[PDB]
């Protein structure tokens, strides 16, 4: 298939306001690269969006949604 450089991307579904404690702010309509995941829900990714400084912190996965980077054309609305 393909194996080189590709991490787990997540699409923000709800804006978030990182407190500060190694937290990362999430914005609706942005992209983040999952680097670390916790069994609590806090995920440590890096905002893959233009930013003064590479955004990286711990944020709730409940604010983002996995883009399921492992599929071949989400089937469903078949044609024939």
From Swiss-Prot:
Subcellular location: Cytoplasm
Domain SH3: start-end pairs: 8-69
Tissue and organ distribution: Expressed in melanocytes. Ubiquitous. Isoform 1 is primarily expressed in adult heart and liver.
UniProt subunit comment: Belongs to a complex that may contain multimers of ITSN1, ITSN2 and EPS15, and different partners according to the step in the endocytic process. Interacts with ADAM15. Interacts with FASLG. Interacts with ANKRD54. Interacts with FCHO2.
Cited function: Adapter protein that may provide indirect link between the endocytic membrane traffic and the actin assembly machinery. May regulate the formation of clathrin-coated vesicles (CCPs). Seems to be involved in CCPs maturation including invagination or budding. Involved in endocytosis of integrin beta-1 (ITGB1) and transferrin receptor (TFR). Plays a role in dendrite formation by melanocytes.
Extra remark beyond the main annotation: Overexpression results in the inhibition of the transferrin uptake and the blockage of the clathrin-mediated endocytosis.
Name listed for the protein in its UniProt record: Intersectin-2
Organism listed in the record: Homo sapiens
Biological classification of the source: Eukaryota, Metazoa, Chordata, Craniata, Vertebrata
Residues of the full protein shown: 1056 to 1122 of 1697
